Design a protein around this nucleic acid. Sequence first.
RNA 1: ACGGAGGGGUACCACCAGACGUGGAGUCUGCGGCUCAAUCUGACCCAACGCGCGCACCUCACCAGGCCCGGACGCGCGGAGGACCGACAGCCGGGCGCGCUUUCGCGAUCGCGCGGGCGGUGGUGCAUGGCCGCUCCCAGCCCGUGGCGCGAGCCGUCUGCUCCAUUGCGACAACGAGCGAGACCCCGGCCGCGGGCGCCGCGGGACGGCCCGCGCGAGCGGGAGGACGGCGGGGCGAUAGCAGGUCUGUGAUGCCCUCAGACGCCCUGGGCCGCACGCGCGCUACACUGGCGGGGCCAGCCGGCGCCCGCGAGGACGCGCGGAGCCCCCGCCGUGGCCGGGACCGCGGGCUGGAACGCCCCCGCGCACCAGGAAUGUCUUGUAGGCGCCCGCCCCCACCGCG
Lengths: 209, 103, 158, 81
Amino acid sequence: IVRRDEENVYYSKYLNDCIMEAELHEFFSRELVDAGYASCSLCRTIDSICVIIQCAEPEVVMGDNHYRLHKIEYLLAGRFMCDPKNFNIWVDKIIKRGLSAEIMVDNLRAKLEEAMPIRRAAYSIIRTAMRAGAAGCEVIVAGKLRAQRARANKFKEGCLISTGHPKRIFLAEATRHIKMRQGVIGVKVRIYNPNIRGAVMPDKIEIGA
Amino acid sequence: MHQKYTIIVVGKDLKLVERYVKSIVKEGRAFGISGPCRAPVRRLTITTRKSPCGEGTNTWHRFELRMYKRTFWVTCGGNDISTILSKTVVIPGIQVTVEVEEP
Amino acid sequence: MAKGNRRDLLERNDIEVRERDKYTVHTLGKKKNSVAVAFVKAGKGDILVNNVPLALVRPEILRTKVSEPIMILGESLFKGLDMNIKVAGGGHVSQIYAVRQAISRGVLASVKDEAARSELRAKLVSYDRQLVVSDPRRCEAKKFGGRGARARRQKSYR
Amino acid sequence: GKVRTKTIKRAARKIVENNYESLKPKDFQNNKAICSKRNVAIIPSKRLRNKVAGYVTTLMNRVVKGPVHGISLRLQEEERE
RNA sequence: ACGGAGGGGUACCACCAGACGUGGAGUCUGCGGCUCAAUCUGACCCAACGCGCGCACCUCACCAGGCCCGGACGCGCGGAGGACCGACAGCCGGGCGCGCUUUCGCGAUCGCGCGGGCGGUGGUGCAUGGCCGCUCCCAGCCCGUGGCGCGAGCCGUCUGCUCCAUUGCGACAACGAGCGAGACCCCGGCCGCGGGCGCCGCGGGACGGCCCGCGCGAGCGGGAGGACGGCGGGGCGAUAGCAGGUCUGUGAUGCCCUCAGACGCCCUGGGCCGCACGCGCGCUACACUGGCGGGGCCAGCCGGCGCCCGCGAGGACGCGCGGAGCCCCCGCCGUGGCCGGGACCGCGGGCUGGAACGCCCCCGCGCACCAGGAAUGUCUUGUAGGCGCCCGCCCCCACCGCG
């Protein structure tokens, strides 16, 4: 009673836009490093596009009189071929930066590029997380940390999950690559917030009096 | 007047699609009716080798992308050109849930 | 070709509407992907499967298998009533068993006296239990180590 | 199966001695309803609830047959003499 | 850590009982050797060998030959009284203003030297990141306070009873916590509510709960009633580690090598497929529990059709509509390497494509093969096995792979 060759337009008009989002994630990550970039989202309103950003300090990306933002809007439109002025943008601010892995790991990358030793950077990150109210943070720094023969030394503090579906909700992970004279220094972070949002971790029972 | 309009909404996650459904049903009870049709789930499947080089046990990934689709074509003549707008802006603006309107 | 769960089947729109309303009872059978829908009414003992009588079902050897409950319970009840089955789903034998299950369950629903219904249940289940209770087992999935659910690719050590 | 992990046992004991009045030694339904009640407990799942209820039933009929260690069930009244 | 030491447990990548196979032949494909101008390379017990997602061109690295600079940016010099860049005729040339005998053009978008770039399926995986594999189809791993030892270390973290499980009971110079295990997520089976172009959204239900035996206890055996009865199939996957694989997946990269007769990029051909030989995963058969001819009939991941030509494969037009093998019934053949089997070869008709060496159809010819030595693999309910059907890569093509 129905034709399957027509709804393929609706289905293929969702896929393309999901992909368009990922290129933006990559571009922002390569661009708004200094603005505490974290993530992105999109809303394909027919008249115009809207994009919502999550940044520690938006005023940096906002730019005096909204210049950087506007310079960006005209740019994306040419690439995705939309009429500019229909490619507007909005920015939102993260308040719990310690619960965000991306902010932490990027800060760590900065601190590392200034030559400070790993032992201080990691534990400063971890203190920052715990102050934010977290049940664990693990840091790892693999590579040619010494003369040769690269090794991984990992730092941790609290308790962490490692398996199960719950690791896709309460466990936030991220990684980066740091290019240096000796070579490449792999770094990755993971944080555990069990009381996140409103969801309740299973196998967790509370009783009454 | 009467324009036989139809509402189609698409999403990849099943929790907002059902939330959007409820809002619309709530906001379209007057401007005629708006009962839903739940379509068969289009599931996209991709199988990939878990290895970038082809070494060791031949082990496979199994991704998929479920896409859920609902269709309120119940407005019909019960909505005018402007009347469709009323509700469509009164419903929540969930970040991701494609919508298209056609007569 | 047919799919079993289709709305065009469960409601049996095949029958015309003025005739669709004379059928009081409704019934279900199944086995594997097969599903059968029966519409039982009042008549003088006639049965049909996909617009074909019961004597001329096709595997030939199983005709007894579908006629079982009649020669068990007796022909009195069935002679009293008239039925029109329709089935759709995988396999000849699956269809046979689904059909017999539907027969039995429907004739069970025709009687209103619960006591007789229980007595008939005991009379019938004793001979066999799959005449009332659906068989649950169903085809199981395969894995990537080989070309079967539990079999594996042959391994050469040297 | 027969996997009665620590959580089940500890929880069952805890909710038992505080609710001996609202439970029975063999029912699985009334015990289940009580555990579902919010004033006493919060079971994030369903299967957890059922398991906890079953262990409670076993624990309470064990009690009624005779006292069980680790349960302060107010029996001081019978033995305070 | 090991023991051809003892004592307790466990598992079809172990055995008992059995089933189906391989190693026997022909053939598809990959692997070493020979040959060649080249027959590009990684991987070698489990833990390399239809695996690094279908090689006529590209892909493409290798062989024989030729265009182009797409030399960023700085300093010195030169230049419109003309920097650099294109072309008819006629040859040489596979070909091209590539080169050549000549004379028309174009116009600073720069030329040369000195520094400095870009790029590179170029080397090192024994310099690295990341991702996988294996240890591991495992059940184990650790913190604070305290105690014993000069100390490396020990107790906690168990020489008892249970559990698939460091799963639990009950004790103890230990007390109290955490990760892993389970819990959790997807699928299926029964019932209810709602909605409904198309069967799809939210919930209930099963918990060692009832009875009987045992056992202090955790828990073991049997019988019920029930859609389902005692981890139903999958996903995730601890600490520590390997000189395991990948620099040939990448605007991931350290140090080397190449950089105007180029290892850059683009074109034309050839090759990766060549064949006295050894072996790895598969496919087809060795027949009567069968082969041929005619007819009847049902699936699921899901899914497109009419009319007219042509034996067929295919083709010209035009619209939106739609599902098979085994099996069952009737006949022929009649133990004959026969009508079993279908490799090889000789005429012919078409499709893809810029281009057949590629793939389909028709007539004729009609190879090995009689159930396979020493040796060896997999498997417990909708399972093995048998039967076919869809997607991936793809101009064409599936004996492969996921289902």
